[PDB]
Amino acid sequence: TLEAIRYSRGSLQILDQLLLPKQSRYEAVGSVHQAWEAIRAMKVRGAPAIALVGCLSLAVELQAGAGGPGLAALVAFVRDKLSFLVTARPTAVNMARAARDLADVAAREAEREGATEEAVRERVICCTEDMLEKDLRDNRSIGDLGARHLLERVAPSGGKVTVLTHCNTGALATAGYGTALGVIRSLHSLGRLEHAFCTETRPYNQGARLTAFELVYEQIPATLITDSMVAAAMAHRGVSAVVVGADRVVANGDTANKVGTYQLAIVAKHHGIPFYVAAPSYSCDLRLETGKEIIIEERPGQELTDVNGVRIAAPGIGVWNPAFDVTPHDLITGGIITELGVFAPEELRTALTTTI
Amino acid sequence: TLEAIRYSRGSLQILDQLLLPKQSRYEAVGSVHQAWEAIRAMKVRGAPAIALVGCLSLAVELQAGAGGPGLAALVAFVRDKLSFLVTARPTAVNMARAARDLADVAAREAEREGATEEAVRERVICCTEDMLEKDLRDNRSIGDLGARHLLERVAPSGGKVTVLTHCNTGALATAGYGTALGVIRSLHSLGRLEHAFCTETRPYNQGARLTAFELVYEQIPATLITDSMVAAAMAHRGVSAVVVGADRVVANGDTANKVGTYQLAIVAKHHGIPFYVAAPSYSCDLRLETGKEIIIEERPGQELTDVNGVRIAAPGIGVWNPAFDVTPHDLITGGIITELGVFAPEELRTALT
Hints:
homodimer; alpha/beta; Four Helix Bundle (Hemerythrin (Met), subunit A); Rossmann fold; 2 domains; seven-stranded mixed sheet; four-stranded mixed sheet; 11 helices; globular; IF_2B-like_C (chain B); EC 5.3.1.23 (chain B)
């Protein structure tokens, strides 16, 4: 029920992430330009969420009659709005991919027999609204499919589970419901969740800031720990499964995700508890054969040394601040949870491209 | 070297840890009471250093002729100030043990035929001076023997090594030179240190605050990382060994240390690099046979949720904040480095009785 995106016809609202977690508050999004500025100010987080907010902000404009008149004028209007949206945060592909589809829909709904302005307007809007529902439904599917598979692996005879997660993959990283946190929501709904542990996820602290917030909001029994306590928690706090999200899963299942994920997979193996990656198919990059081919983005060292504008670390120390690490697929012992199902790493490539 | 404690006869200064790592201010100490305040104010950190700072403040006063009159009074004076010092931060026993023998030293030489006021004074002052030197030499030995063992294990053909460490075990945790950081200092002096990685060590950040400070200070080539980056560093940044300190090593070698240590050991094993625990013999507790007997401290949740007086974590979230975890001895693949040198866990009980 936590919504980072609120949408109805003619009406788009977004939860302002900058104010979290002290305050939860929405901002009305009236125009494509407003969306662009919100995305850039980091009010909207998560590539799927960024894409939807931009596309829905176009749908809000169109519903108000913006664009046109004519068809070429309207299609041109749509294309310039979409292309402008792609410039907001090009750090990820979701917006660009959604922009093509909508541009194609509007062109594939600008070149028919007896084509007309109102038809283009309504159909572009409807696809955008279909995008939203599909993404929400797929997230729920990840949650339910992943929850079932995890339960069958860890407590098939009934009996609850204690899940540990990393970074933020919830409503605050997605259109809604989430991926790995979606699995936790689904387990809670089934009444099969004993407890959820979440790590701080240094240095950007999204587990402490956002995942903690989501868990408290949903009143899911939960505990925050430091990244350094993961091993202790598995040994002493009865952790029975690990579920994380993914920034990128490559063709063999190697998973780039927020740094510390690789470490989590190692410690889970040591304690013989299954490790799951939850990722929609559109987070799976079948071009790359292995994790070797991934460039690990490194971010500025001040983002590690400083918190809230105050330097914590000693002056002059060198810093290594990779944003992500890569988990080799042989440590993904639970499986890869997609909207299409749960797959062993070696199965992923063929499964995603030959099943619906 | 970096000195948290600067002492010469009649003069004691301590590095004010509260102001680290921005500033280095040395605070002169002319009294046992002054010491007591500094220990309670947490200007002094590390059990050995706390014990030495106390005993040495007594020594500055004994050098000051504080103590009178006779001999029986001086012994009485000494016994009192040591009892006083114990009340500062009893959380660490190093002071208690220090007091009990410094008292017993003051006793035997008081019982000595023809015992005199001056002789028993100098002898007490000299004793505390000897404790300082011994502790420094023992740390140097941990570092030197540890470093040598590590080089033979990891780089027998020569070649430099990259060491990863956790929390703070250096001059800012000890009398000087340090234990795990001592090994890094020794590797560096030998020109065999490629690089040192130190973890932030959440939630008290001793790695980011203090260990990074010491490494920069001694111009040791070093990089700070978060605790969650340890695995990535091992796989991609050529870490060739781990060396950590210890709060308590028990008879079978099971080691209680700053939470995350157990995690480092697991991650080291995964990457097939040796894991060392550096521990002076007085950090070894033979009264307990295994880590199952260790009762883990949980500190308040606020000290995890908040940084710098400002809450980071989402309001209302439950918190688990154990101070320590326990590393099983069979993950101590490097060895346990005492001032006597490096032992496999199985050898430790025999070696220390």
